[PDB]
Nucleic acid binder design. Structure first.
Ligand SMILES: [Mg+2]
Ligand SMILES: [Mg+2]
Ligand SMILES: [Mg+2]
Ligand SMILES: [Mg+2]
Ligand SMILES: [Mg+2]
Ligand SMILES: [Mg+2]
Ligand SMILES: [Mg+2]
Ligand SMILES: [Mg+2]
Ligand SMILES: [Mg+2]
Ligand SMILES: [Mg+2]
Lengths: 170, 50, 205, 159, 293
RNA sequence: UCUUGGGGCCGAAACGAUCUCAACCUAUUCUCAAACUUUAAAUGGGUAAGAAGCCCGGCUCGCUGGUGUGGAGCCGGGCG
RNA sequence: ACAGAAACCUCCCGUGGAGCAGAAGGGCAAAAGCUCGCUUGAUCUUGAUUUUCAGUACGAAUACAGACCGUGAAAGCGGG
RNA sequence: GUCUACGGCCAUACCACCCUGAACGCGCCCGAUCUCGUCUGAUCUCGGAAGCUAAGCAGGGUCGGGCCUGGUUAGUACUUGGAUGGGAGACCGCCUGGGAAUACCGGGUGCUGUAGGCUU
């Protein structure tokens, strides 16, 4: 019988919209995430100036927000539904996380408004077990230990049971 | 005569060639005699020598 | 084109490598240090002769290139192009300068790079040849002919080590049988009685 | 010529030993330094304040003043044909109590104890040290074993 | 393939941090400035008041540094508070105040200064500092060692500090980090602080939960119910604890009892045992190989 | 060795197959440093080897201070 | 998702292989780096000391002492 | 036997993986009213006590890497002082003293202070 403290959970869901440029588009994207998550997101600036991409250093080009708790489960369901609960094997990282892309946010049940437009966004799910927070605390930080980590196979296995999803090959 | 040999020969009181003295042997003195090795002939005198 | 090798025979200056302070050094004459059948396994060539320097001097990269050719050509003629493996054991790292005159004279006399040399000690191996045992006489002659490309005095010495390895030939065969030695191409890896016991399982399975 | 730079030539002198960088152990700050103490000066590159000048690295002096962080040290310095008693202000990271006198203070107490004890026993005990004397006569037992004969080995060219 | 970073050379060159740093327990940048005394004060001890709040306890200690290690001069634990009538909430702000008060009275009792420096016997929750009395032994002076805690307003380390200064210890501090300081107006409300010291924020929560959801109330306060601690009596419960702490702060050590020698973990294997184990493993491997063929 | 490339090579063609040579990685191996270094000499540079010491009792302090605590100074005494 | 060698998001390894204005050397990891909040110890003042040295000057630097201050919960730290 | 708080020295203490953890602890853990801080009660702060040693942590293991310490290397390399020594030189030998470092082989794998617990 498995220990109750070894059961997988969603540490957080991280939603990102790299608009690629500053100005009106980025602000509108900041409003799509707020509608979807119900919390104010944060803008991320460009680390470097890249001529090809047309982005300058310290220029806001993307907006993102982290969602935890029961809200993360609710929003994750919307995206996984749009994927028809189908993910590729390569969608899972070797550290036990996974994520997927959404091309239009309107598929997530967000009612379209003329002054916002249509955006895509990234979905990333960080999985975890209880006691993953020892590596995030200030006092007596530690490392969770080999036996407690989440493998790619354990993450894929969790996704199937949790959602009855399909892991396509490749 | 080099400075370190010149000082050690003065402490033995051998300030002139073919001068002689008795020196009672021990770690301190045997290592002084090693510094002045090129400048002295020494050894153990018998009762007749004394 | 260059000064006679008597002008740079002796190790008079501290080592002067090609570095970020000494820039503009021309390439060395010798660029190949191994020729013959380099790929022969450790066991094909048990015999190894050496050319050992009897002097503390500087060997120019031109003399190393010439000797290598002289020793290699003889081995090809007398042992075949695949009966031997030569290894030049000196690399010309010390840079020699020139203060080029036509006139300031000795004002600002620090010289520009002229060439490269190898600094060799007494008893230090200059070049090595490994082949089959029956070619012992052909190794000695090959190295005897190569002594004429060098200044100073050299000694030809037939090593008691097996090939280019560091292990004596009189016990190399047993060490391989007991698996203290594992052929690894031109040489052998040494297996100590240490480390994970899964390594021992691998070797003994 | 050379420069008159203050830290010229201290590339190795002031660097920290191998795998001994980082925090300074706090017992370095808990040592008690009193007036009259003999201390060995050893500059430490980790702390750049109160650094002794290179010439005082490796010298030993006497403490004459103690402030909140530093001490005043009277340390001899030879300049040409004279030796000056120099007063330097050094932070206590760059000094350590000298053991050079502890062997002496150990001997005094042993001397003072023995002198007192021997006196009440009416006996004489040596108090002054002596240089190591020549070894005295002794017997060496063969145990019925002939000494192993040694011979020089033949030359071998191990080239 | 990518280079192994943690190869042999990465370990040859590696320098470990201080053990207490590796453990994540000690901040040596802060410790140096806390424990180190001025050299012209020589052997004068530099006392500090260590406050560590664990998941279930509060440890209050008075220590000074020595070359062999810190010498604890007096300690007071929150697991002692049941002796003084407080059964539950041994990590809340009110408990921290009691633990700090117990630490102060216990020290002053030990030095014989408890009668001289009684502190602020009536808790007002306001700024108060003990001033030395001329002709009497001076007031004991220590500094707060807050460890790695985030010293924002309302941190319980300042609850214990308040309890210690109200007991008669001299600890430099301001009211900026007591609960009741308003960052907006920059004004300290002592009456808010007095509420936390008497645990009314907890009491208000119990009433709030009781009128919101009984099930939540039981989940949140199961042990308060088991011990019959109700919101009305909390303030008196703490006030009694202060009187009792002041009446008798001495600690009677638990009397040690001899026990049967019991070992609860394996000792090291000897060289012979380790060596023989490898021989058995080798024999086992070859034996299996011969059996298969 | 697919984590990338060049040659090939069977194809309807894909990370399918097949090799082959390189880059990469892993253990080895030859040869080096005035402006490299884990190690690390010899010779060398300070300091100490007493009465200006040691050990007792007391006194002054505006310095330090939970403390008659600390530190410094000063006075008297005993030890060759 | 667009997204590619390189945009942004996430997890993991990471002894410094970065950064600290500049030459190099030293030093530095809950910091000396990066980001925020508050600030003007880059202020006023007498002596002592160090470095070059003749034991002169300058310059630079080091311990203090007296004021005023900043910062911090505080120990402290700061007169570039 | 062992832990907690604070430490000293700062790998014999680190790193990797595996096994075992009685009691008390330390934890993971459960919440967000209050104090306090976040895009996010993840962290920080605060209020708790249903569950669990899964993890951290402690002890142990590995012909483990590292580290520590011995042996060998080796009286070798180098070196103080000496000669109207050798040798065309390069350099070398001897005399009088000092005297290393790899590879290779073995052994070890934290000690301990103050205060407070648990362990018939
Ligand atoms: Mg593990
Ligand atoms: Mg020259
Ligand atoms: Mg702090
Ligand atoms: Mg900081
Ligand atoms: Mg001042
Ligand atoms: Mg249990
Ligand atoms: Mg939580
Ligand atoms: Mg377990
Ligand atoms: Mg090992
Ligand atoms: Mg232990």
């Amino acid at each position: 019988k498995e220990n109750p403290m070894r059961e997988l959970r969603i540490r957080k869901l991280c939603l990102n919209i790299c608009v690629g440029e500053s100005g009106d588009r980025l602000t509108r994207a900041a409003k799509v995430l707020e509608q979807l998550t119900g919390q104010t997101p944060v803008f991320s600036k460009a680390r470097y100036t890249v001529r090809s991409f047309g982005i300058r250093r310290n220029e806001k080009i993307a907006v993102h927000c982290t969602v935890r708790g029961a809200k993360a489960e609710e929003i994750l369901e919307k995206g996984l539904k749009v994927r028809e609960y189908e993910l590729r094997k390569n969608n899972f990282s070797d550290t036990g996380n996974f994520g997927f892309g959404i091309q239009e946010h309107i598929d997530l049940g967000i009612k379209y408004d003329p002054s916002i437009g249509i955006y895509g966004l990234d979905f990333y799910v960080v999985l975890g077990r209880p006691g993953f927070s020892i590596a995030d605390k200030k006092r007596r930080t530690g490392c969770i230990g080999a036996k407690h980590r989440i493998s790619k196979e354990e993450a894929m296995r969790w996704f199937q049971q949790k959602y009855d999803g399909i892991i396509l090959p490749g | 005569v080099s400075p370190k040999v010149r000082k050690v020969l003065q402490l033995l009181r051998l300030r002139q060639i073919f001068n002689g003295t008795f020196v009672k042997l021990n770690k301190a003195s045997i290592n002084m005699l090693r510094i002045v090795e090129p400048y002295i002939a020494w050894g153990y005198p018998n009762l007749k020598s004394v | 084109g260059r000064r006679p090798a008597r002008c740079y025979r002796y190790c008079k200056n501290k080592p002067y490598p090609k570095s970020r302070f000494c820039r503009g050094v021309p390439d060395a004459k010798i660029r190949i240090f191994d020729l013959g059948r380099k790929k022969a396994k450790v066991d094909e060539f048990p015999l190894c002769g050496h050319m050992v320097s009897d002097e503390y001097e500087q060997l120019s990269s031109e003399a190393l290139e010439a000797a290598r050719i002289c020793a290699n050509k003889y081995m090809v003629k007398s042992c075949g192009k695949d009966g031997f493996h030569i290894r030049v054991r000196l690399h010309p790292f010390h840079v020699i300068r020139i203060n080029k005159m036509l006139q300031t004279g000795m004002r600002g006399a620090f010289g520009k790079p002229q060439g490269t040399v190898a600094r060799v000690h007494i008893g230090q191996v200059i070049m090595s040849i490994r082949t089959k045992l029956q070619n012992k006489e052909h190794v000695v002659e090959a190295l005897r002919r190569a002594k004429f490309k060098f200044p100073g005095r050299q000694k030809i010495h037939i090593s008691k080590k097996w090939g280019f390895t560091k292990f004596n030939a009189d016990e190399f065969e047993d060490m391989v049988a007991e698996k203290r030695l594992i052929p690894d191409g031109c040489g052998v890896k040494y297996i100590p009685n240490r480390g994970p016991l899964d390594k021992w399982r691998a070797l003994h399975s | 010529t050379n420069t008159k730079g203050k830290r010229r030539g201290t590339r190795y002198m002031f660097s920290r030993p191998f795998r001994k960088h980082g925090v300074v152990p706090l017992a370095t700050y808990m040592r008690i330094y009193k007036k009259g103490d003999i201390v060995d000066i050893k500059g430490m590159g980790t702390v750049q304040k109160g650094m002794p000048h290179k010439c005082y690295h490796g010298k030993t002096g006497r403490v004459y003043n103690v402030t909140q962080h530093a001490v005043g040290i009277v340390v001899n310095k030879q300049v040409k044909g004279k030796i000056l008693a120099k007063r330097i202000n050094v932070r206590i990271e760059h000094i350590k109590h000298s053991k050079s006198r502890d062997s002496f203070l150990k001997r005094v107490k042993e001397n003072d104890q023995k002198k007192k004890e021997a006196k009440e026993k009416g006996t004489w005990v040596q108090l002054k040290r002596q240089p190591a004397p020549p070894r005295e006569a002794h017997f060496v037992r063969t145990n019925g074993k002939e000494p192993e004969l040694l011979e020089p080995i033949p030359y071998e060219f191990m080239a | 393939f990518v280079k192994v970073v943690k190869n042999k050379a990465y370990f040859k060159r590696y320098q470990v941090k201080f053990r207490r740093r590796r453990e994540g327990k000690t901040d040596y940048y802060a410790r140096k400035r806390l424990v180190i005394q001025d050299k012209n004060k020589y052997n004068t001890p530099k006392y500090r008041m260590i406050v560590r709040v664990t998941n279930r306890d509060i440890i209050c200690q008075i220590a000074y540094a020595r070359i062999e290690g810190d010498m604890i001069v007096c300690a007071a634990y929150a697991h002692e508070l049941p002796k003084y009538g407080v059964k539950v909430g041994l990590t809340n702000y009110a408990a921290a105040y009691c633990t700090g008060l117990l630490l102060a009275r216990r020290l002053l009792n030990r030095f014989g200064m408890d009668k001289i420096y009684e502190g602020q016997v009536e808790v007002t929750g306001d700024e108060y500092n003990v001033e030395s009395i001329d002709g009497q032994p001076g007031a004991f002076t220590c500094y707060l060692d807050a460890g790695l805690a985030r010293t924002t307003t309302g941190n319980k380390v300042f609850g214990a500090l308040k309890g210690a200064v109200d007991g008669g210890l001299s600890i430099p501090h301001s009211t900026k980090r007591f609960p009741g300081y308003d960052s907006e107006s920059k004004e300290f409300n002592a009456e808010v602080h007095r509420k936390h010291i008497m645990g009314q924020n907890v009491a208000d929560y119990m009433r709030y939960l009781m009128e919101e959801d009984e099930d939540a109330y039981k989940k949140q306060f199961s042990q308060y119910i088991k011990n019959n601690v109700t919101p009305d009596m909390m303030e008196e419960m703490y006030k009694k604890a202060h009187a009792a702490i002041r009446e008798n702060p001495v600690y009677e050590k638990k009397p040690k009892r001899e026990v049967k020698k019991k070992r609860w973990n394996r000792p090291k294997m000897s060289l012979a045992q380790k060596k023989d184990r490898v021989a058995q493993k080798k024999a086992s491997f070859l034996r299996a190989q011969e059996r298969a063929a």
